[PDB]
Amino acid sequence: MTLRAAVFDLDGVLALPAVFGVLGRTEEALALPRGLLNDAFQKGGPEGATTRLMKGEITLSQWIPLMEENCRKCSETAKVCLPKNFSIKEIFDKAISARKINRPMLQAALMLRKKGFTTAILTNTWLDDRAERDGLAQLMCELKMHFDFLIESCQVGMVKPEPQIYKFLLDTLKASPSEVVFLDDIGANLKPARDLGMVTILVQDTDTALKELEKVTGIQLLNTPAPLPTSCNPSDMSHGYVTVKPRVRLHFVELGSGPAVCLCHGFPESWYSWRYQIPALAQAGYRVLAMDMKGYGESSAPPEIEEYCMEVLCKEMVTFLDKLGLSQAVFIGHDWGGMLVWYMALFYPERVRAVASLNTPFIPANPNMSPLESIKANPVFDYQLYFQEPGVAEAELEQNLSRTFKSLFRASDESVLSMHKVCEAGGLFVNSPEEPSLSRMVTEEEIQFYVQQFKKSGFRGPLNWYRNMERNWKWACKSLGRKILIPALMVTAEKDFVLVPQMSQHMEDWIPHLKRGHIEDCGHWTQMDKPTEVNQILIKWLDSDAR
């Protein structure tokens, strides 16, 4: 009163259904004396097998037989048989995976952390060495990244409801009994909290629990809006660096395990533009590698225009796989990244497990008509022309990097950048403000992140991507006999007024088994505009087509 810390039980609070509640169904299922299992589990109390397990004295595999023993003699003093195929191991395997994250609680945890609460899990638990231990390990990873602390009984050598562990909790939280909330499904584990003077909640059904927590903290926790996906903190990410050419080195951030997925951002962005997708796809069972594309961030940024034609760009990505020892990867790209991704499927399909683009359609080059012509053809591409002259587009873009991104990164219903008559107007920003408002799509902090990156090498490199029209076209014409017959998803964005969804309308001709996806009310900056639906669409497709 008032609080600034929130502590969560695992079994039956952050994870449901609890293992003790499978313990119980088992009895009913097999017509066992009510509580037989539980008798054998709690057996010996503080000096028995189960407690030793929770303190890390012995392992779960070690405990299994001691439990089965106790079940014998619990069922001896009760005078009853034991079923043909009785396995404490099978019962506990089922229970342990049956248990999933309790989403609303986790969200509640997130909320409170977001408003500056120190969050911690206090959980009686064991050193798991069963052959199927990896599942609980996954669970525990997913959770722990969202908390300041994961205090586990077997790691600390103390157990709930033993006071020592609470003194240790307070100790770890650098906070006082009256500044802390502790929720648990077990009254016994609450009484101690109380005696130090802690706010406590007996977590029965989750919704009432949240009601108490809501009240006593004064923050809306129930019924609050759909929260964004998890976003990366750059300094907590694995940063990878692969040189692919004497003086070109590509950097990327990597997270997760399973089939390699290579994310490729558009102009003028950064691996950070995939912050919402990195955790989600990792969590869905993949190994995300989010690029700094050539010209950006910590990836190299050589001046020469040719060093950014699609061909050299693509060979380089091949090399990238080569040097990481990856025979393939599923390639997902957006804006410029999309185009490349398609051209990877067209030229190196043996290396592409699957291809995917957000917004960017696949258009075949017109062998007759040039591309400078084809671009002047549609007025909404005028900005492309303005970018041709080395040095002009950079001067403007670099002059106030904050202004620039603040001006670029806006939701469909927010715009400040018309894209037509830019050459004539004489600037991308000729008639946009010096200090633009902050979009709904990005915290001030997220903008500053991009500003830092772009101080490294400016816009020369990025703008060169637009400066190989004639070359890319010539190269592209080599592929005019081919089709894309590998798994490909196309993902159009209703309100992207430059990569318009109609531009993809014939893509099936060259990509006949193409699968589509589409986002209402979503602008050009797909990833940060609609991160949830992007994750849903992509994860879905990955699972269906990348296995």
Add this chain to the structure above:
Amino acid sequence: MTLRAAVFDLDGVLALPAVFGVLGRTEEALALPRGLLNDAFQKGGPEGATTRLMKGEITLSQWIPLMEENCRKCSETAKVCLPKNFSIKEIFDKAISARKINRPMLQAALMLRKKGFTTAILTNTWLDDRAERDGLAQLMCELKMHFDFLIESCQVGMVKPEPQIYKFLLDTLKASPSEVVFLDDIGANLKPARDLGMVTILVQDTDTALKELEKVTGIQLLNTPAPLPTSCNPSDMSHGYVTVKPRVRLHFVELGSGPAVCLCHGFPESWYSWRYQIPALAQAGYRVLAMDMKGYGESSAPPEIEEYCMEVLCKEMVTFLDKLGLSQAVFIGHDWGGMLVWYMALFYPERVRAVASLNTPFIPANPNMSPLESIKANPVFDYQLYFQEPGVAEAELEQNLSRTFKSLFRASDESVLSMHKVCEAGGLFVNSPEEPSLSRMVTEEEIQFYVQQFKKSGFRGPLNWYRNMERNWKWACKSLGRKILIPALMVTAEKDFVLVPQMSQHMEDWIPHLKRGHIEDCGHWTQMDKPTEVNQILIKWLDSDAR
């Protein structure tokens, strides 16, 4: 005359059995008119489906039906039926995977490169988009890393035996017809080489081919000794960096895909100490992550002694997985790394898919007797005592880093470092030479690599590993109730006179399903002493126990 370049055909030279020789067996198998298939394949010559495919005009999946068509009309003008279940796709899938690397040829390539030949593959081949394309992709990766150039018909848009492609070959090799050798299974593809004035070899059986090559180059290629495994070039590796604590960042090198395998080196080494294992395990189907352990290389090296007790070391590696999104990894370690690896299995088994140590046994702490005592107990551990006093062991080790490694890294039958009476002698090197000879185990270059790394942070950090005896013991005693019941391999080295194989003799008591492995004539520096047998033993065990 004399040559300095060697060019290899793929199908039927670097890879056997050739696809054309499965083409043939098929005919016999199904009682087809001799050459029916081949007629339909070569059909249309330079203007037919097959050539278009080799030039990259169309894809393999695109070609499949045109081929089946030609087979129809080849078998129409021949007046014959076609089998119930006729599939050009099935025949070519079988053939394409049936084909493996022809080892002796590849070795021959390696040799010649090792003596300063420019090596290249010139191969008629296709853009592979079949659903089972990944296999050929793997093959092609394995090969290409060992060559200066992989010139592929469909990538270049030219084909063997068209002169253009040879002009392009010479062009790419920056060399002249008379400085080049070209081997092929097809006479037609040789005649052109000849006309420019190239040395050529009709590759029939591999051994005669090598005989001609041997002669005309003047280097022994047949019958030469067992060549070492592939070693890493550090600048061609993916370098990863993960901060795990405010001012500690761990670096590692990463290669391959599949189940994560985390390599952990000993004192005083580097991820480079696994150079022979990195490629091999990657090639065997794994994702190697070779560490710079805390205190070494590009990993951080904080001064405090406590920052290197096993516990903080282990939590850090847990964090390491956490931040890379890996729920588990198989941990393999050597020397000090081994010990840690065991203590990871003991404390965090949910995170260890499997454990493995080279030389380092698992010994449980003696709860009664201290560890400083236990160490003075055996004379061959005297060096450990000498390392206790901060600053003394460093001064010696850092004074001439070349001398130091040159003195440390020696095969069993080479030694210059006795390890007993070091305190009394007053130095590790008190009676070893200023300029030691180069071991058989390491090129001058490989030594300099270590010297560079150790200029970063000296030996303070590394020596601290030896300086937490009392702490590690106290921690270790918490685990005295446990056993290791997860897959564990122990790998003893006959002639390691400090981590002696007998020291492991009771390990089965605490690790009951423990699997062993053993290396004759192999010293302390296992990895570089016996890299082949190490790869064989570890890959074997990984495949049996890490799946």
